[PDB]
């Protein structure tokens, strides 16, 4: 065995049905390969290897794939960009993401870190060799991470550096909490339901760990300070509808109120294109009950700078870089060539 | 690669102002932008940063509510807003691109903020407007270790005042300082003459101050005691 | 939040060192010339980007980082500053000596009779005839430092290529007649002079 870190074009694999109209299947039948039946892992005994989740090329290829899945699937009636405007036909689609696996070609292999407190950047004691990652759902969402993998043992805090306030911090939860979003049978308005008891228990635990990493300082949360609608609220796609939820009450400092927390959301039809660019118009929503249950597995936060001369650290929710989503799922993988 | 900032602006107490930074030569949408402030005589202060991709921001507690940063990605332009202008806010404001932070591929590999590309700065001057001609006062000479005497020109607006000595015939060792803008939004300036001590009681010195904005001409003789 | 010395000077062909004291955190350096926009020189204590001269170098030793400039040229005349994230130093004027150093005359003028007849008290301190053009002006009431009411002007070239500066301390007569002593303290290339004045 002789290897070195390398960057290569991976290929995706999935268990898409070839006879499906749901668009993640349509896209994976042509873009990916069938997933391997009986797959092999081999533990590399007494091997220690340094991973680094914040510099990892898998994350970038997975972004390009997801970008290109959305551009093929989402059908906005109008697209308006730098002077342009294209009107098209915009039927509604069957939307629900499916697990994707990422796989090395010949001559390369994917190292996977099995050390279960692994924050994402250190050296790793219990390394494995695999041909594919596990099944990652390409769900895009801001503020909260949905339908992801859980932390194995203790809640984990990831960041390229906590002392640099310009770097996103990613909290990976112990134990998931359901978020139930529903537009029922004026018609843009919906809401999400969260069990306040479970959630606050978890949020208390998340502050105790943030306290660990900030020299037992006083931790408080605050609404996002600025930016576009997609980052200042928990945004996401359910069944092709673009939901935007005010999550202010999710971070209620006062009570670290324990019935059900209900967040006000709206289904929007004008959305910014997350290919930077411009905006896209979508058709008004379905009739009947649009309903999505999702595990909350992670949160993306930003620490407020200044405040060295103080006794408190303040955090605000916010995504914006969809790539950190991917990082929260690929932090244990690294591609090498033999 | 370059940042082109907007020209200098003048405002009164209260009010708001907006100053822009126009990127060119590079992909504005990657890379974070910080703003920075320098008051006259002080060092730079950090005002916050703004990720032009999603518009996310981060301001130190002393400036949240007083500063806001925004952008327009279609023209690749950053914007800084200073609300509730006080005389403290008179300063030089700088926008800068940090190649170490941002979305997309070309982060530069520096753990510190890589404050790479700087604009030239925009001057925000807070002058409580109105007018007000100045009052002129003698800096009288008193206590080899020769003589210096002069003129204090206090509380006027706007610039400028002209100062001269003996209606322009004295030019030897005279030096009129720049005006300084005080807490009151009014300017003040001083002018001096080094003279040989053997000339007090025999050579005579007059301040000639002229402020045309308010029709004011004063002649103030400086006597020692 | 990072100290830094206010001025530093040396002559062509020599070398100088700017320091800032205050962090153990990665520090980078910038050089702002007159008329131009700042440019990065050193990052992360001692690294150089491509396109920066080998005369610039960086070093750190327990809570103080240093920028060192070898083989000084007069194009290096400028302002130099450091940061460790949002922790910034006050900046240092670097002068490449183009003429012999000259200490300042300072004279401190008390409130004129005529301004006190108008209920105002302006102390004015005029510093003149110095090179390099960088000084510190500190007001003292009796023995104590003064923070409020101080407006100082930046050194501007005199009529003979030396520098002058002016400083003003604005008081009401109450606070004026409440100290018995007031002084202007001017520091220049190490040496301080203090002129004192009294309600008399
Ligand atoms: C190494 O990783 C495997 C994953 O299959 C895990 O089951 C095992 O407990 C790990 N070993 C140690 C010592 O943690
Ligand atoms: C992650 O762990 C490594 C050691 O394994 C440590 O050097 C690094 O500071 C840690 N980072 C965070 C964000 O905890
Ligand atoms: C939600 O969380 C439960 C753990 O209680 C897990 O078994 C289930 O797979 C999760 N659903 C997802 C990830 O869609
Ligand atoms: C959650 O993590 C905390 C500390 O991070 C720990 O005390 C607790 O046992 C964990 N809970 C679960 C369900 O693993
Ligand atoms: C989600 O909410 C709907 C309507 O409020 C409810 O009927 C449904 O049972 C909920 N689902 C879960 C898993 O709680
Ligand atoms: C919320 O979770 C708690 C567990 O802490 C449990 O009683 C139940 O699942 C929920 N309670 C209510 C009142 O909804
Ligand atoms: C934890 O931090 C607080 C500071 O907010 C301090 O007052 C308290 O004593 C600390 N607790 C312990 C057990 O040290
Ligand atoms: C969410 O609601 C709270 C209080 O009503 C506050 O954070 C903010 O006004 C709302 N956020 C929006 C409208 O984006
Ligand atoms: C926090 O919880 C309780 C609600 O029962 C109350 O103190 C307050 O209204 C809440 N804060 C919010 C909703 O921002
Ligand atoms: C999360 O998984 C559930 C279960 O399949 C699905 O119904 C829901 O749409 C998913 N949420 C998102 C945002 O993809
Ligand atoms: C930021 O984190 C790195 C670890 O990757 C550490 O070396 C560095 O000291 C931290 N920041 C500063 C300013 O030192």
Automatic annotation (TrEMBL), chain A:
The keyword Signal does not apply. Keywords: Disulfide bond, Fusion of virus membrane with host membrane, Glycoprotein, Host-virus interaction, Membrane, Viral attachment to host cell, Viral penetration into host cytoplasm, Virion, Virus entry into host cell. Disulfide bonds join 12-32, 77-90, 103-132, 113-124, 181-192, 238-292, 245-265, 255-257. Glycans are attached at residues 46, 119, 126, 147, 161, 174, 180, 195, 216, 246, 252, 258, 295, 308. It comes from the Viruses. Its main location: virion. One of its GO terms (biological process) is symbiont entry into host cell. Residues 2-81, 84-338 form the Human immunodeficiency virus 1 envelope glycoprotein Gp120 domain. GO terms for cellular component: viral envelope; virion membrane. The keyword Glycoprotein applies. It is found in: Virion membrane. This is clade A/E 93TH057 HIV-1 gp120 core.
